[model samples]
Target chain A: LTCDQLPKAAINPIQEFIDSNPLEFEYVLTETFECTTRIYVQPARWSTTKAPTALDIKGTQIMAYDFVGGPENSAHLNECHTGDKQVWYFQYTNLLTDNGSSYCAYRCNGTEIIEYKCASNNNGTDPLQHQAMEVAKTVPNGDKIHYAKSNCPETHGCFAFY
Target chain B: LTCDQLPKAAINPIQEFIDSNPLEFEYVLTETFECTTRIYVQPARWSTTKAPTALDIKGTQIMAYDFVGGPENSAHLNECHTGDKQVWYFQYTNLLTDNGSSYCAYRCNGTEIIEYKCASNNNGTDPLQHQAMEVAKTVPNGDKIHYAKSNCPETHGCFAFY
Candidate 1:
């Protein structure tokens, strides 16, 4: 979907977030779909000027990292596809302003972050890290929120977490 | 424009053409617009397999050539954009089934190639090289037409003509 095809109610806020906080949001999250095994972000990343090294949701900063469990490091983000959908698996670590050792990744609609997951350490466990509850607030499946990734290279800290 | 956003009347025939002649047509003709000193083919090229090295319109074949003009040569098609529209300054030579010494590049709508211009040699004359009049029939300005360009790294016959 070209950015416009997404629901207006859902796209407006992301555009707003983009317009208001240019540095905080480097890529526009356009479309997300369940392709059997995972979700996909069409066009992958939207910015041309920056590769998207980190994401700041609310006030927490999630730096790009390989999370030591999947895919190798590289200049580009890592992705995989399962049947009908193109997918990008994410890995993140807390930055200087993190509210907790644990951080969560969420899918945002234009109005709010609607889903969440805690970031993992080298082990698959959540590491007790989560974005601050106020910052990581969840909305019903319908509201929209911001989306983006880090500018770091793969394995070198490249991750998608918003 | 996204494929879904394109005019249904104009897009349908091209889709039909694609459905019916899969191998014969490897790529889809997309956007065409005038830019100063050059015209650009938006997205440049779209294909099911490899990038298009040449174009086959109706029955005539348009091959890419360095045309003994312009810049040296490169691995990709050349392009330039002038505000409102982007354009590609094409240099193609007639191919095997050409209907006339002069060849035309037509913008295609589903049922027809709507706009056209015969290619010119350095002498500034068409040499009456129009694609056969039967094939060169015109249509209204709003109808969409097929578009394309040569494959680059010239001398490999990467040109596109219709």
Candidate 2:
């Protein structure tokens, strides 16, 4: 399968993301500023000639301001890249200093990428706080995942980032 | 402050819910259901006269069927009510008998309703799995309470009730 089909930039390009493209691909943007991170995924396109490589899919986390509703206000940081079916962890800094603020993870595609599915584990609101969320998956039609926010350990925004 | 104005049914009435009046108050319905439970919430309203009481906002968990898309097909079991400002846990049984299903919770009003805000902890798919969600409140604006699910943990349908 073609490996290099993954976007050229590990993390999304600040200048490239606009209302027209809003995201690189279908993405999960966490509302909580913990890592202030957004997870994105593009359906793996398999090609016969070009065998896939590990770096074909990269995880580039960045620290940018006004990247949520407005323009990318700062430089982008490339987190990492991998080819295994592992959790791609990304981190980001909020409006403050360049230090880490929040964290999130994406269940990425492996070498095969059978049965396309990606998920975000809502760790907490910010990096300092340790709040947990309740999650459940339905039967028969496994299309949906549910979360309960009442049993949280700490406090912050009511919305949990996937 | 009027305690009597608090919604009487701390937990939702399975039999009373209908698509016409699908919710007791305004609510946001999460499409995910491990046990096929629907979570509902209304902003806590407190009059100037009656001060809010902790027990007045008791959390009542229940067990019922057919409450998802329509009315309850059978009797609903009132699980329990508690005064703690903890996770207002609720349970349900889906199309099968006592199998592990979905769950959800309502972030009801507790003592002293200083500001009106309701939230979901993003518990697992249903009450049976015991997944818990964390919640917090900002200092002002009361805007953090507004959760845009575009960044959710998994794929699901989302509609606000109010």
Q: Residue B49 deviation, candidate 2, in Å?
A: 37
State each model's CA lDDT, in order. Answer: 0.23, 0.22
Residue B21 Cα positional deviation in candidate 2, in Å, after optimal superposition? 12
Regions of model 1 farther than 4 Å from truth? A1-162, B1-138, B141-144, B147-149, B152-162
- Candidate 1, TM-score vs. the true structure? 0.18
Best by TM-score: 1
Local error of candidate 1 at residue B50 (angstroms): 36
Fnat per candidate, as a fraction, reads: 0.00, 0.00
Complex DockQ per candidate = 0.01, 0.01
lDDT of 2 by residue, A115-140 (tens): 11112232333433222111101112
What are the chain A TM-scores for all the models, listed individually? Answer: 0.24, 0.19
- Candidate 2's residue-wise lDDT over B56-107, tens digit each? 1101122211111212221221211211223232322221223222222333
- What is the CAPRI rating of model 1's predicted complex? incorrect
